[PDB]
Amino acid sequence: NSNKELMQRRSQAIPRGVGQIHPIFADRAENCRVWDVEGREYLDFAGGIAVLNTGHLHPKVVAAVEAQLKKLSHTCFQVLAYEPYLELCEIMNQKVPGDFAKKTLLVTTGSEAVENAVKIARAATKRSGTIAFSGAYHGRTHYTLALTGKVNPYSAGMGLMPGHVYRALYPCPLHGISEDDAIASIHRIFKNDAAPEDIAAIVIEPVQGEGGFYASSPAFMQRLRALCDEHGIMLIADEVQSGAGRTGTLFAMEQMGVAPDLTTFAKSIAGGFPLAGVTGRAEVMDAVAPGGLGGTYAGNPIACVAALEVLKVFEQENLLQKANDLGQKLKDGLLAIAEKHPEIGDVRGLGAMIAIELFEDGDHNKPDAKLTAEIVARARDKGLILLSCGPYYNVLRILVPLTIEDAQIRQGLEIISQCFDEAKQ
Amino acid sequence: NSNKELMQRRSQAIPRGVGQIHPIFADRAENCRVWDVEGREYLDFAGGIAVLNTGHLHPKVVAAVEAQLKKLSHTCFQVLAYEPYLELCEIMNQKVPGDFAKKTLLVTTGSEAVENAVKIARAATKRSGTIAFSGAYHGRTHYTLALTGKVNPYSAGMGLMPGHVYRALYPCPLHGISEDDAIASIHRIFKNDAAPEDIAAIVIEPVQGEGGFYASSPAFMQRLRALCDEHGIMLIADEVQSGAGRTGTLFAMEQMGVAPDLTTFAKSIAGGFPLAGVTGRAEVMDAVAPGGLGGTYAGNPIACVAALEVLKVFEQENLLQKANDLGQKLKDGLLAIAEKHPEIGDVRGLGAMIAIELFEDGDHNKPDAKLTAEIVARARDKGLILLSCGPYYNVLRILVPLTIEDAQIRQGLEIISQCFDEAKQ
Amino acid sequence: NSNKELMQRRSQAIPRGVGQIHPIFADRAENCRVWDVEGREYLDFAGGIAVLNTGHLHPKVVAAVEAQLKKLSHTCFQVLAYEPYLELCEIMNQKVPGDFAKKTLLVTTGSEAVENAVKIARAATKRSGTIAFSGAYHGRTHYTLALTGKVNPYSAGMGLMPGHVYRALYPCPLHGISEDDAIASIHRIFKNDAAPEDIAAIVIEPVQGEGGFYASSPAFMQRLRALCDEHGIMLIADEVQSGAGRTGTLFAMEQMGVAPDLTTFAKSIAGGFPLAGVTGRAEVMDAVAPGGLGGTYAGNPIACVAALEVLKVFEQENLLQKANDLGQKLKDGLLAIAEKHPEIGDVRGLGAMIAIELFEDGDHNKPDAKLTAEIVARARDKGLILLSCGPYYNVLRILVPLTIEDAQIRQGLEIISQCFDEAKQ
Amino acid sequence: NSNKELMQRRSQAIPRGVGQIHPIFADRAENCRVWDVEGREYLDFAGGIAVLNTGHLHPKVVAAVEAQLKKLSHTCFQVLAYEPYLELCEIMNQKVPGDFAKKTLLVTTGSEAVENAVKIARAATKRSGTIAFSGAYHGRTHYTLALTGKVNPYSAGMGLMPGHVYRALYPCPLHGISEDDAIASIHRIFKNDAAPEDIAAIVIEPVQGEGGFYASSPAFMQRLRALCDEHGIMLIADEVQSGAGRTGTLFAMEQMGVAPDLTTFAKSIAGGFPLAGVTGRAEVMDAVAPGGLGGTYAGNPIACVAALEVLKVFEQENLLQKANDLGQKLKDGLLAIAEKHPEIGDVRGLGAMIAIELFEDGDHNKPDAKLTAEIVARARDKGLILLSCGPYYNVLRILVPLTIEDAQIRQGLEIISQCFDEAKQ
Numbered sequence A, B, C, D: 001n002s003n004k005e006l007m008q009r010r011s012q013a014i015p016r017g018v019g020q021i022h023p024i025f026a027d028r029a030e031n032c033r034v035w036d037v038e039g040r041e042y043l044d045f046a047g048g049i050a051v052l053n054t055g056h057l058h059p060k061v062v063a064a065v066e067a068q069l070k071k072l073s074h075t076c077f078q079v080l081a082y083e084p085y086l087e088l089c090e091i092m093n094q095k096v097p098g099d100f101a102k103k104t105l106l107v108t109t110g111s112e113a114v115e116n117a118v119k120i121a122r123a124a125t126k127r128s129g130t131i132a133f134s135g136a137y138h139g140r141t142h143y144t145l146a147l148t149g150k151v152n153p154y155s156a157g158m159g160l161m162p163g164h165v166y167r168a169l170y171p172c173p174l175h176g177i178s179e180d181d182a183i184a185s186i187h188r189i190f191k192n193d194a195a196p197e198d199i200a201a202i203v204i205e206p207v208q209g210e211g212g213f214y215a216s217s218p219a220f221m222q223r224l225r226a227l228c229d230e231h232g233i234m235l236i237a238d239e240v241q242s243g244a245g246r247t248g249t250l251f252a253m254e255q256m257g258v259a260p261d262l263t264t265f266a267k268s269i270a271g272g273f274p275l276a277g278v279t280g281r282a283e284v285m286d287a288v289a290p291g292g293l294g295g296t297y298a299g300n301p302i303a304c305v306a307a308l309e310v311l312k313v314f315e316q317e318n319l320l321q322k323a324n325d326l327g328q329k330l331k332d333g334l335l336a337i338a339e340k341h342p343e344i345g346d347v348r349g350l351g352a353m354i355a356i357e358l359f360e361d362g363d364h365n366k367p368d369a370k371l372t373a374e375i376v377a378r379a380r381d382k383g384l385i386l387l388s389c390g391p392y393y394n395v396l397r398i399l400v401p402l403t404i405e406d407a408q409i410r411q412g413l414e415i416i417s418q419c420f421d422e423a424k425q
């Protein structure tokens, strides 16, 4: 009945390993609104971490889910197939950028998708190594933790994660890492630790999520594409977070001018239901022999119809266009707040994948994690749910549903504005 | 909308890597019945691979899920908590064997569950290695494929999986591997490849699933518990398939006389919805640092209320007792069929985790995979969905819902009988 | 100038990790005789661990070393070549078993030899994995420690050695490991952990050295050759200790009835000078890209002429024949002693690679390591230098120079006799 | 004989993997001169690759070797000890930089030295990972190949070498890598791939050998020392090539104003005889349990006395001072040449570890591997033996024995002078 009472029960029944950003227990929600067990209402700007681009319980999505719930919820596709799985795969084959034929594998979590994307690139190229970028995030399975460019706290006390994962530098001028540096950092790997003939794939987020909402430029992605082409290396675009419309296009790669060989997706693809997948070159996808791709819950029937409905909703409700409008509105509002607060050293973002980075006295060398965390706390006190990110915990991101109403856009910014103001005195 | 038609589309849009045991597209289901897209009815003895111990769309479970769909489907627990996740953890801490304080983490798939249990075991012991058994199955992520005692097809063509996973022999007298050999193979690892101080844990299925439905004796499990104790090794019981009441007790470990340090669960735990978790000795669970455990969909709201309801159903409908009664009825009918078919060299199983193993001319060293495959095919033509298993593909298992009707017990056995009779012709 | 003071100095200058079997400092030696700094004389039955098959400072060898010492000692072959290196390779190409063209590489230590043989096999098959046997010993580099079937003390406290090295069972009837068991253990790796297409080679000692002087039968070696042939796996014969004529033939494989794809050699090859090498099927040896192989001291000029002279000595002095007779005289006297002491549960060996194993009350399950240690200690008190081995340290081995004098043979046996009598007294 | 005839036999008996810089077969050598089988005389400016700082067959060294050759050549220190080994360890413990107690392990090759240094660091810190630098060279065993910052052609076709080796950038202002970049690259590893608590050691060459004769500054070495101190990481200085006086001090670290925890040495330590070793902080060296450190040839008797004699010679003949004088003469000579040849973009070196780097049209971005190779070829025709190096094969190094006469210094410079003039014609 009370948040604290539940937090106490949480401390006795659940390990501390599982962090709790907001010590609040949600009871119900709708679109951009969430009510806790105490009846307090909050404006959701986190969206279950980019999972709710269509909002909490989108009515069209729920109706689809209820219909399937009347038919069946599980059989395990590998044993007995079913249409929602097949249908979504065909739709994904069409929506993911690429003029060649694609095939889609459905799993359940983003971690699984990345895991499987890599397995596939290995079977296709008959190579074992992979390259990932600094500040990257790909999941919490041993292998994805190795791909993830961040050790603490995910691996603390555990020891070293799986080898044969090499680290390249993600391009980021704001912090002195040029596109030439990033590209140079890959050749360095080829020259020092693993030749091209041993690299199955280069995994990259078109727009890093946990890494701080940093976007790759089309130019860079084009260089990366040519580099992979030259070495028979599979380009894996991890769009688990950037995908499903966040950047203004269904997939961020559509704005890069090049197509990846494989793409992983999840989170917002099903608008609040467990589903993930991999879509890529048909022949690369088919490199794995029959029986080598599976998963009990893979492509859960309910989640499949949810995803299918999410995609219809994007089309009928013009969410991509709104995503872009929202991003502009958000960026204009934040640049306005920025004028009165030098700590805001950057307002960026493609589509609605918006973020601001805080710096101690505008020094691009002094990340202000203290201010960042304070703003998140004050925002919560004012009924607004926020999340931070970045390898230094000084980036504030906005992952509010694309279905957000205009008045709620102003409300959220006004609250953010008040937080910075009150953080002065 | 015919099976053949849908299969053609399958080959065009989905990777062949995703095997298809039965070329049938299920449309709807109810308890033990499943109807395909052509309207044909089937008796389900596979159960979505031990995922439906409470049957397809159990009314109580479905009603709980429908109620929760009016509240919320996702927030990501680590950001905004919710009570169903918490409640399930409290209940699992009590239900999982072990007379000491315990804590639970919820994830989404069995693979993730095994992944996390190992991460936890590693953090608690400050060690990196792990020992798994021959014929074991633990998932399809890079690391769990290594734990999995089977390379083909699971990880074929992909190159070698993560090292620092050693292989022990699972006790199996039917095939000349005594418990002494099994215990001896663990010491062999200790002396030849990895000292006890480098082994965080020994992962074992109380009853092997894909491995052939081979059960560990209480005596053996007890020697294993003593061995882990002497060396400070965590005993991880993988109960993703043996759990959720399939053996007559909620968890097979209850029948072993000893408690593991960690236990993984999934599949039947939520009767048709994506959920999994890890329950273990509180001090071991707490070893991971704050923020080190987490996944986007982990402990999904809908899945949780579903799991809670499954637990209530087991109680209200006496499913554990029924599991045992069902198992005895099954083995007896199978033994009656064996009187007329030597090829059946063994009938076995705890509770309702039943299987029979085929041999050419009853020669216990001549796995009869051709016949096994023939029985599955014949069964399908008679409307019965079955699954085989075992390293040599000569084991037929029964994972029909525990909520099976008396008549369906007669029907499935009768069909099987006809299959052997019509094959012997 | 006393052994005691030198040992004290040793404790302050040299790491304890370097063990000292005998706390004696040798000053000079001749053939089978050794004198310590205190002028005491000993009979060497250890031969610097199978390094002095031609005895300490064989005059013909020394004369050759002296002649080369006037010319040059080092240029580094890969930079500026020299004849002794080339000539030795040519001779080894002829001497190593295998009725087909071969090429040879010279390195410096047995460890490097195994390292290179594996590198060569990997380039030749395009595979990364290897299989080695229980109780095997292949060197103390990271990789050769992974290949070695013994963790402590070789790796104690160091953590886990390089992965992708799988363990098979060495055939050993005396301890219940049948040949069928050995072969079956290889297929187990193929099924549970690494498919044949990922195994570049199987490394095996025709006769295990540190492992207990257990020899492989021709029948077994033949099955192994067949198995490797079927899968295109390189068979690597590690003859660093079994080679250089210790078994009656120059290389133990000659007595197996089949040829390995690669053979490693060191120790006795150069009668007490630092040299090692790898000899193998020409096509296989050529797989490595030009400039991929190298080592600074590799094929040291002085060690080469010593090796070339050692081979001449073997032919001119019929050491292969004397090896067999020495072996026979040793076994006879050891069997003689065995009749009075049941502890000696087995006398075995090919050529002069002779050993006896000790058990508590002839109980093949109670390895008498304590008695073994006592015998070594007692023999030392009597002026005889011996060495033990075997995973349980209950194996006494004789590695006395093949050039030993008949009276010394009797002398040696008498001492061993006296040791057993006085121990059991 | 004929060089070419010997080369033909070489191509038939030895694998192409063993490259041949100079297609010449040496017969005799002395100090700085080498005579091939055709009787042709050459001035040696490569020194067997920095193995002959005291020149070919230094008379004092040969005499000691002959004296030991009359006593014994091998017993294997672990079985029976001998004074030469002990004496060398005692002397290295005091000469190797480090104001604290040290212990020394003697092995045989530089590769083995690095292998053991890492093994020791791992046992001492109880961690498994290591960090190495770009362009580094540490040996050709699997593990040292992983430490080595160059894949082709060492690893070609073999697949990926051992994991858990992370790449840092070596400071090299000439090519755009600042010391800040170098240190930053280490923190990048701590943040992205391996936490400090998992890093047992950071391996570095005070002056990179094969990497291009690029030296670390005291300032940088001091920052590195401070970083290691802060995390309890062992700083291993691989002075196999930089050691034994090449830089003007016995070890290059002396000039860094800071001491390493472990130092590996080989090459010139024994002036042309197979010997290598590890000298480091005593408690660290002793972290390995007895029996854990070994090697058959380790600390070969003859090589030990040669090494002890080399040490006396440096003192008696003032080679350290001569190394600095020689370097100054070479650099002055080379600078004069560079006044007429723009392709020479840099003249550098500590003591007598001298090198010049070649660029096309004097552009640091355009390495001239072709000119470099031409100079080597022309130099040889003129009777001068040279070696090149660097990741882009455009670096000419000088490793002539420190015992060279002024006339020969002038002669070598003149020969090099002509090559450039004649290469531009």
Ligand SMILES: *Cc1c(COP(=O)(O)O)cnc(C)c1O
Pocket (backbone or CB within 6 Å): A109, A110, A111, A112, A114, A137, A138, A139, A140, A205, A209, A210, A238, A239, A240, A241, A242, A266, A267, A276, B294, B295, B296, B297
């Ligand atoms: C969220 C995330 C994941 C991991 O997905 P899960 O559904 O939590 O297993 C993978 N990749 C990226 C880019 C992510 O943001």
Ligand SMILES: *Cc1c(COP(=O)(O)O)cnc(C)c1O
Pocket (backbone or CB within 6 Å): A294, A295, A296, A297, B109, B110, B111, B112, B114, B137, B138, B139, B140, B205, B209, B210, B238, B239, B240, B241, B242, B266, B267
């Ligand atoms: C089914 C299974 C798994 C993996 O579960 P998924 O939900 O398919 O990822 C793990 N271990 C065992 C024992 C299983 O049978």
Ligand SMILES: *Cc1c(COP(=O)(O)O)cnc(C)c1O
Pocket (backbone or CB within 6 Å): C108, C109, C110, C111, C112, C114, C137, C138, C139, C140, C205, C209, C210, C238, C239, C240, C241, C242, C266, C267, C276, D294, D295, D296, D297
């Ligand atoms: C002695 C031995 C080695 C290691 O040789 P070293 O010269 O000490 O490196 C390798 N293999 C076997 C079979 C050995 O007995």
Ligand SMILES: *Cc1c(COP(=O)(O)O)cnc(C)c1O
Pocket (backbone or CB within 6 Å): C294, C295, C296, C297, D109, D110, D111, D112, D114, D137, D138, D139, D140, D205, D209, D210, D238, D239, D240, D241, D242, D266, D267, D276
């Ligand atoms: C030469 C070298 C080595 C390898 O030593 P070897 O005697 O060839 O095995 C190791 N480290 C460095 C710095 C070297 O240049």
